[PDB]
Amino acid sequence: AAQTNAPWGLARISSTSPGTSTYYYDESAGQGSCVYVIDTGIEASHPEFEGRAQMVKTYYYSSRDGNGHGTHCAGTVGSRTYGVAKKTQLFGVKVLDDNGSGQYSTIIAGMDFVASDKNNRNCPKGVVASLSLGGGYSSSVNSAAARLQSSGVMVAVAAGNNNADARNYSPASEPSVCTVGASDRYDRRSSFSNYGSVLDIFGPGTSILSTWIGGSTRSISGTSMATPHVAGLAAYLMTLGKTTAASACRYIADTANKGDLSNIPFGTVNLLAYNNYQA
């Protein structure tokens, strides 16, 4: 399939070169997979989700996304226009309040929730979780992410927006999950993107157009935006049968565009998420 005039990040993930505008992908499009977006929620009513999104959990007085951040991330995973995996099922877990903040204890509860909740969902092709959040180093937060991964979920987490080594942030620093840095449309490391040995992969993160609350759309930037490209890619690849939850981060690294990003610090992977789709 070909989507013309796609957001640059979608075009990037199906291209051996920057500077193109058509997204190419297998029509299966993540059908039969599931992606949890652990964030401020998802506006499930947004026409862009086509009934494929739903809220499954909140820790606050509402499951509504009163921020937009979670809706944007979910859009990059699986919206019809702005998404990588256009037929995946999206599950919202609201661990962040409408200010975009969340106590680590609530975030941990949300991760353990997903590990159990997948057993209540139909995801024959596999399960992914996208965590566009983080804070300072916490062994408990890392351990929760590790459990989620261990349970059979492909966990993708944001590296962070500190232009610093991600070793000092969680869940970014957890070795067993897929830690995602951000790039821009000219294949530069995004200026805010964290880096370091703990990174596994980069994805498009600067000036990313996606869904927003009130049935709208918005361009924003962050490792929060790169993460759902990788989560959606994993779901897409799992539907194709090319990889599994336990192997998807490795597979994505194996098949990434290599050595093409600029301003990658010595010791950080130079790998850009790529679907290796040949139309």
Ligand SMILES: [Ca+2]
């Ligand atoms: Ca990993």
